[PDB]
Amino acid sequence: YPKLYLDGPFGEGHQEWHKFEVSVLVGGGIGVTPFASILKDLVFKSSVSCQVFCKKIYFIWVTRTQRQFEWLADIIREVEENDHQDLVSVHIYITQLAEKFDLRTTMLYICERHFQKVLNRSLFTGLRSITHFGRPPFEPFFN
Amino acid sequence: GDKLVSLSRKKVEISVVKAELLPSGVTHLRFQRPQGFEYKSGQWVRIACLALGTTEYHPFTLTSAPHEDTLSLHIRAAGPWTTRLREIYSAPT
Amino acid sequence: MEALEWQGHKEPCRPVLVYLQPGQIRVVDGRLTVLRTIQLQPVNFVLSRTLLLKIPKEYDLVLLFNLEEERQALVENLRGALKESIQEWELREQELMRAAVTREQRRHLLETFFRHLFSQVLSQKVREALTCELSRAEFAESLGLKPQDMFVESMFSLADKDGNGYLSFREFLDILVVFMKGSPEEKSRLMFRMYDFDGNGLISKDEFIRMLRSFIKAQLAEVVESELTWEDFH
Amino acid sequence: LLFTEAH
Ligand SMILES: Cc1cc2nc3c(=O)[nH]c(=O)nc-3n(C[C@H](O)[C@H](O)[C@H](O)COP(=O)(O)OP(=O)(O)OC[C@H]3O[C@@H](n4cnc5c(N)ncnc54)[C@H](O)[C@@H]3O)c2cc1C
Ligand SMILES: NC(=O)C1=CN([C@@H]2O[C@H](COP(=O)(O)OP(=O)(O)OC[C@H]3O[C@@H](n4cnc5c(N)ncnc54)[C@H](OP(=O)(O)O)[C@@H]3O)[C@@H](O)[C@H]2O)C=CC1
Ligand SMILES: [Ca+2]
Ligand SMILES: [Ca+2]
């Protein structure tokens, strides 16, 4: 493999969710890539530390289709497998119209609602998280 | 613009756990750490004490390690504000 | 040998190398990174320094060459290679270019194919798209999964009724209507058929643990411990 | 309980 030139972190990574006991992390479109690292760091922090002020994390992923972000499904799978304190609750919202579904979206739909799970995990992805189809109800969820 | 930036930040309000009148005119203040207060070594904060009726903010280096539960400051008696702070924190209650 | 691969007017051509296995043909980048592998089972050619090999099921493979002699040598070798296990035309460069269906046109055809399939599960272009068979690689890519994945292999082998290595519209429609409108007993039967690799009517403990790991050694065995036929699995 | 139900 060729060698890379790396310019260090420019993020200036506010971690304000640690300031709150309960936090809701909302990701949309391409603005969901950092949440993989965020969730992995959160689950590691809650695994190594006991009295973490952040008692519960809600990760609301909102996307049209999971194309180019299928790796995020595996990352969420490993995060929920390593979530030994039920810190992270993941909710995926596929907002694609039913007529414009691709093969992956239809497979997700049928495995979520037209096919029984095995260990409460969908046969397609393997996530204990529930995947929804439509606009996420932010107001009723917050209520 | 600098005044507006300063106003943008929200100043937390905390209580002092312990006050020590260390010799050579030094005041050691241990006070409650804010819930979301995360800092690195060598960083400094600003403090104000309304007991002097001044609302004046002065910078002081955090002498406490980030792994601790409370924040500590070692304030030297340099002038009016520091001397008044030492005098007010000399007595309990 | 070296050649140039054309992927449409918009997409630039790239230098590739062609290898001829006894039954398979490999188009592999000069870095030795495999790009395409095609299998011949008992194809047409178009000549122009342009050689258009028309794949009946997948997108056509067209090659450009520095000289006509190199193309002639390649076609002479390929005729013997394919005859070991055949029609040729003489067309112009523009005619050969327009007679090929590239990757982008295949993607559009698959898009309308999936559109009609999902519309049915819940006209010239429609008929042309519906008369196409999806390869395993295309099926995996449309699923968003790797070609060598347990779910894609299980579903592709289970859905391939004739087992020709390609998935047609009819099989996909039947399996999708089974998934959507099938009875719970029928859904359990479909899951049982997809779970067993050998398909001998029973699930082995090792095979059941393999299916569990597919869903994702001692831990899996302990989980399985707490054969199993159709009724037992249900 | 959480009211997670898309529109
Ligand atoms: C980044 C930083 C960190 C510091 N950390 C500490 C600490 O951990 N412990 C400690 O004892 N002292 C510290 N100081 C010293 C700081 O100046 C004190 O707040 C100061 O001694 C208070 O002076 P006074 O108003 O009581 O007396 P003054 O009579 O005002 O003191 C006169 C001197 O104090 C300085 N000074 C006064 N007010 C301010 C202000 N608002 N900002 C900057 N400088 C001022 C002036 O430069 C002057 O030289 C720090 C200063 C800086 C800039
Ligand atoms: N932090 C940031 O500043 C970020 C900015 N962006 C910007 O957003 C732009 C578009 O992002 P893109 O990559 O296309 O993401 P997408 O639009 O592909 O996905 C975003 C998701 O949010 C939903 N959504 C989008 N717009 C609205 C809206 N107005 N109201 C309600 N729901 C909405 C979409 O559902 P549906 O389409 O079904 O309505 C979609 O599922 C980009 O130009 C990018 O610059 C993106 C990510 C992070
Ligand atoms: Ca077939
Ligand atoms: Ca079997």
Side-chain angles (χ1 to χ4, degrees), chain A residues 1-50 52-122 124-143, chain B, chain C residues 1 3 5-9 11-16 18-20 22-23 25 27-28 30-31 34-38 42-48 50-56 59-68 71 73-75 78 80-81 86 89 97 99-102 105-110 112-114 116-122 129 134-149 151-184 186-188 190-194 196-201 204 207-208 210-212 214 218 221 226-227 229-231 233-234, chain D residues 1-4 6-7:
Chain A
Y1 296 145
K3 311 258 283 178
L4 287 175
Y5 277 74
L6 200 282
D7 218 322
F10 305 105
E12 196 253 345
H14 298 281
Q15 288 198 1
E16 210 96 344
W17 48 83
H18 283 144
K19 300 183 181 179
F20 297 86
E21 44 178 34
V22 175
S23 301
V24 178
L25 306 181
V26 182
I30 59 178
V32 82
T33 307
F35 284 112
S37 177
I38 292 178
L39 291 180
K40 293 190 298 183
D41 165 71
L42 283 173
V43 300
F44 182 86
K45 206 102 61 182
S46 189
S47 69
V48 298
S49 303
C50 307
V52 179
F53 180 63
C54 187
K55 252 71 69 184
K56 185 71 175 183
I57 281 289
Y58 297 96
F59 173 63
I60 300 181
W61 187 11
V62 184
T63 23
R64 183 118 37 83
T65 60
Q66 297 184 8
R67 196 186 117 266
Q68 297 185 122
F69 289 94
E70 301 98 2
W71 56 275
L72 209 76
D74 308 354
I75 267 63
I76 290 179
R77 201 217 324 270
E78 101 180 34
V79 159
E80 78 176 34
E81 288 176 345
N82 299 18
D83 199 338
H84 290 333
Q85 310 299 331
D86 210 301
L87 179 73
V88 180
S89 189
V90 183
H91 300 263
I92 299 96
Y93 287 87
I94 291 297
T95 57
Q96 178 69 287
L97 299 173
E99 305 86 70
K100 227 184 303 298
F101 279 1
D102 57 9
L103 200 58
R104 157 168 269 269
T105 315
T106 47
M107 231 51 57
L108 289 173
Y109 182 74
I110 63 171
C111 286
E112 189 69 27
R113 301 163 107 251
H114 293 342
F115 216 76
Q116 60 134 346
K117 281 74 184 300
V118 193
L119 282 312
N120 264 336
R121 294 158 176 80
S122 67
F124 189 26
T125 44
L127 309 176
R128 287 186 282 98
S129 309
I130 298 301
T131 303
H132 309 268
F133 293 87
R135 323 307 310 185
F138 288 116
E139 181 223 59
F141 180 84
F142 295 157
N143 184 32
Chain B
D2 198 300
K3 217 76 191 69
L4 292 180
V5 170
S6 293
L7 260 68
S8 295
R9 307 189 314 267
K10 165 50 60 191
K11 330 294 188 300
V12 199
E13 202 263 11
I14 36 83
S15 64
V16 163
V17 178
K18 183 172 58 62
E20 255 179 80
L21 260 58
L22 296 177
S24 298
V26 184
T27 313
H28 184 202
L29 297 184
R30 241 83 175 271
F31 45 97
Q32 153 188 332
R33 184 173 180 175
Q35 182 61 238
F37 197 89
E38 181 182 4
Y39 67 100
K40 283 180 165 297
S41 296
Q43 295 194 274
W44 54 275
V45 295
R46 283 191 245 265
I47 70 171
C49 185
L50 306 193
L52 299 325
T54 323
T55 71
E56 206 175 353
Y57 277 103
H58 294 258
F60 296 107
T61 302
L62 283 169
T63 64
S64 60
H67 71 83
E68 301 177 12
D69 75 321
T70 52
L71 306 181
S72 72
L73 298 178
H74 285 87
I75 296 165
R76 306 178 304 271
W81 193 88
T82 50
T83 302
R84 296 305 317 282
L85 187 69
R86 190 161 198 262
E87 187 59 32
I88 175 63
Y89 276 88
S90 303
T93 69
Chain C
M1 295 297 298
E5 220 272 356
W6 175 86
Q7 283 183 334
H9 325 105
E11 191 125 82
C13 310
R14 70 194 181 284
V16 206
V18 179
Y19 283 92
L20 293 319
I25 55 175
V27 189
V28 173
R31 200 117 58 194
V34 46
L35 299 174
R36 187 177 179 182
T37 54
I38 317 174
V43 295
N44 305 337
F45 322 108
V46 179
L47 279 297
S48 169
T50 302
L51 184 271
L52 171 58
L53 164 61
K54 181 178 305 302
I55 304 301
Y59 56 101
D60 316 306
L61 171 75
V62 69
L63 271 62
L64 307 186
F65 297 88
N66 239 339
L67 285 313
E68 301 255 63
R71 177 203 50 161
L74 179 56
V75 70
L78 191 272
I86 301 301
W89 283 262
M97 225 79 72
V101 45
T102 183
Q105 296 180 341
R106 265 214 72 91
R107 284 201 289 99
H108 278 153
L109 189 126
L110 266 49
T112 166
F113 175 94
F114 282 123
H116 275 1
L117 196 145
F118 301 146
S119 68
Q120 296 181 33
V121 80
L122 194 149
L134 273 63
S135 177
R136 199 215 306 276
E138 296 177 346
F139 176 71
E141 176 64 23
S142 55
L143 276 186
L145 296 179
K146 305 168 184 56
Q148 51 281 345
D149 192 84
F151 183 87
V152 327
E153 299 285 5
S154 303
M155 194 176 185
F156 181 75
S157 295
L158 194 271
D160 205 4
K161 294 171 171 54
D162 54 338
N164 57 325
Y166 292 79
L167 213 162
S168 62
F169 184 91
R170 191 62 239 170
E171 320 159 32
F172 226 145
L173 202 282
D174 288 300
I175 195 169
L176 253 293
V177 301
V178 164
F179 270 105
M180 286 208 61
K181 299 179 177 300
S183 297
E186 220 190 312
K187 297 194 185 310
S188 67
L190 208 287
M191 187 190 321
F192 183 86
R193 290 178 45 81
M194 200 216 68
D196 47 359
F197 201 1
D198 57 351
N200 67 329
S204 173
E207 177 177 280
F208 190 91
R210 152 258 163 89
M211 189 276 308
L212 172 65
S214 299
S226 301
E227 310 280 67
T229 181
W230 197 100
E231 316 300 328
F233 207 173
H234 198 154
Chain D
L1 210 66
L2 281 179
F3 183 73
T4 67
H7 306 167

